[PDB]
Amino acid sequence: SMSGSNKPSVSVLGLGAMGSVLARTLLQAGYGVTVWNRSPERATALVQEGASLAREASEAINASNLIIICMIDKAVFQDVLSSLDPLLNMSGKTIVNMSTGTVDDVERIAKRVDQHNGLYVDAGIMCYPKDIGGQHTTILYSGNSDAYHAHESTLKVLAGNPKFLGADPTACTPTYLALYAFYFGAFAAWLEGAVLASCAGVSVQDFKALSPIMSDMLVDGIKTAADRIAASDYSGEQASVDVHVAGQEVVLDALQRANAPHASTDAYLSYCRMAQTAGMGELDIASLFKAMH
Amino acid sequence: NKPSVSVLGLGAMGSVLARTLLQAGYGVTVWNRSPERATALVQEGASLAREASEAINASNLIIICMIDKAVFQDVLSSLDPLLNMSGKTIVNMSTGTVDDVERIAKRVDQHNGLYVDAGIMCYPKDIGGQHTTILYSGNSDAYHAHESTLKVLAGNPKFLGADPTACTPTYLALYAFYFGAFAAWLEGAVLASCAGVSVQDFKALSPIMSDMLVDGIKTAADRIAASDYSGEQASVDVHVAGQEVVLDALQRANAPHASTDAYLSYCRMAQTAGMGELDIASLFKAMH
Ligand SMILES: NC(=O)C1=CN([C@@H]2O[C@H](COP(=O)(O)OP(=O)(O)OC[C@H]3O[C@@H](n4cnc5c(N)ncnc54)[C@H](OP(=O)(O)O)[C@@H]3O)[C@@H](O)[C@H]2O)C=CC1
Ligand SMILES: NC(=O)C1=CN([C@@H]2O[C@H](COP(=O)(O)OP(=O)(O)OC[C@H]3O[C@@H](n4cnc5c(N)ncnc54)[C@H](OP(=O)(O)O)[C@@H]3O)[C@@H](O)[C@H]2O)C=CC1
């Protein structure tokens, strides 16, 4: 392939907000990078910094033995595969798909890559572009173990704290989507609180300064609730579901009187009421897991 | 030479406030509507008051931890008007509305008491913790006079100002965040479980997202302060396209998706307002 500082070639397909930064990060670490994007405008800055732009997705695939996909979704990578010569030889090449998509997409893609004699790793980026290259940054991976481990050092340029979740190409997606269900539900909750605080004359900077109290409590609460769910041990001596409900009905009242949105609080109260309906009123809040299952 | 403290309300939280004070060598007088709950505290050296009145009379620091502020207002209302609270600081750690706080502060004033409203930012197991927070607002002189005593309950107190009503909105805003986030975690843990991921394995991965959220809060708060919603990190539209895949996974697992629906409703608010291309922090402007 070649190098420069004796590093192998990598290809990046998709140069949006995330893909462009994957390419730049590899270039800056001394990797040869071939890029491809549906629209060529996005490649100009990368080309000026030493990337090669491929005219066709096929040429980007041909250029490297490590092919990183970061398009809007897995479905559009299926369309890219469909426009390849069916006999394009991907022997010795590892496709790493970092695009958001369904387990059905992953299954279809793994099959098509296998038909080309390629190796397939599914992946999920657990950060915003600004944190790519971070020692603490996580990308999730699942699929061909030999292929992942062969490219592990290269992929570590993008994220210093990767997690290999197992050999099943479909393992990454459900975990990835579950962690982002948590992340964005929690981020909406934070906004919902920041808006209530603001309505009471607490600046967003002052609410930011207090937020770690609750981030620390949530780190501990997740540990606590996970250990209880593992043990099916929902004894209510810390706090009952019923007391959680009485308290959060006061939070709702405050949101309604502030004319602040309360969709996140409505969601939590609905899960509480599920648990009460199931006779879990006296139990620990961890019992919501069983009521929700 | 430690002073007397009184605790009224010996439920899950109040019992531990009383126990923590006893164990630190404070004289503690307890009261509870039902006497069964006082037995464990009497085992550990507490004096039991027959009436709420006597618990208030017993000490110059009176800590309330009843189900809500409304029932403490009812206890106050049934006191003899000649009960004298001169030199006494009432600290109300019960969840309640700003209207409850206003009524209680008035009644305490009528008895010549000093009033501090408070909000406990932990479960009972974390009471006594050096990093544990209780929020306080109201009489500054009274709070600071009792600050050493109250520190034995929580080593990281926050005094939020002299207005007795200051604590409640911040307290409720932080719990809006905490329980919305906890429901989101449960929503994810159930999805993972439906795909055969053990709750212990989901617990082990959760810090990835807790760390990302600590950074996301800082980032979003700085953008909201600056009204700077430039979309170069990720657009609302890309957030929506991604979370519609999360929603699909929940629907196909027949798993609940109310927390995801709430986030997507805020996203759709922002899109409708023409913020599709902006940073996710723009949801604040769409919401407020
Ligand atoms: N940005 C972020 O913070 C994060 C992003 N992700 C995930 O990474 C992926 C990419 O996100 P991001 O860079 O923000 O998205 P952008 O919208 O910035 O980029 C989308 C990319 O997909 C390409 N694309 C869209 N439609 C097609 C198509 N039909 N054929 C070929 N290429 C197409 C775009 O090409 P063009 O330039 O021609 O439009 C562009 O390269 C998503 O799946 C996202 O969920 C993961 C975590 C964080
Ligand atoms: N547990 C926790 O983790 C946390 C609790 N809190 C707050 O602290 C408060 C107490 O919670 P918690 O200890 O869990 O609740 P519990 O239900 O365990 O205790 C409630 C207490 O209120 C008393 N009570 C109820 N009705 C009356 C009444 N009419 N007159 C007098 N006393 C009455 C009960 O007396 P009786 O024993 O006779 O029923 C009991 O002492 C709530 O406002 C809650 O939101 C805040 C932070 C965390």
Q: Which residue has the tokens 């606590």?
A: A224
Q: How far is the CA of A101 from the centre of ligand 2 (A)?
A: 46
Please state whether beta strands B47-48 and A94-97 pair in parallel, antiparallel, or not at all (unpaired): unpaired
User: Which experimental method was this entry solved with?
Assistant: X-ray
Cβ proximity of B116 and B137 under 8 Å: yes
Residue of A nearest to B97 (CA): A250
Q: Which residue has the tokens 């396209």?
A: B241
Q: Give the closest-approach CA distance of A277 to chain B in angstroms.
A: 16
Alpha-carbon separation of residue A257 from A61, A254, A262, A264, B103 (angstroms):
58, 5, 11, 16, 18
- Ordered by start, the domain boundaries in chain A are 1-166, 167-293
Give, in degrees to the nearest 5, the angle at Cα A126 between A179 and A265: 40
Please state whether beta strands A139-143 and A119-125 pair in parallel, antiparallel, or not at all (unpaired): antiparallel
Q: Give the closest-approach CA distance of A78 to chain B in angstroms.
A: 16
Q: Which atom of ligand 2 is nearest to the CA of B95?
A: 43
Q: Which atom of ligand 1 is nearest to the CA of B235?
A: 14
Residue of B nearest to A102 (CA): B245
Q: What resolution in angstroms, rounded to 1 decimal? A: 1.6
What is the helix (H) or strand (E) element at residue A53, kind and residue range? strand A52-53
Alpha-carbon separation of residue B188 from A60, A64, A176, A219, B24 (angstroms):
36, 36, 10, 15, 41
Rounded to the nearest angstrom, the gap between the alpha carbon of residue B191 and the centroid of all alpha carbons in its chain is 28
- Residues after which a C–N gap over 2.5 Å breaks chain A: none
Interface touch A181/B178, C-beta < 8 Å? no
The finding on whether B120 has its CB within 6 A of some atom of ligand 2 is yes
**Phi, psi at residue A167, to the nearest 5°?**
-80, -15
Closest CA to A22 of A125, A176, A93, A117: A125
What is the helix (H) or strand (E) element at residue B171, kind and residue range? helix B167-194
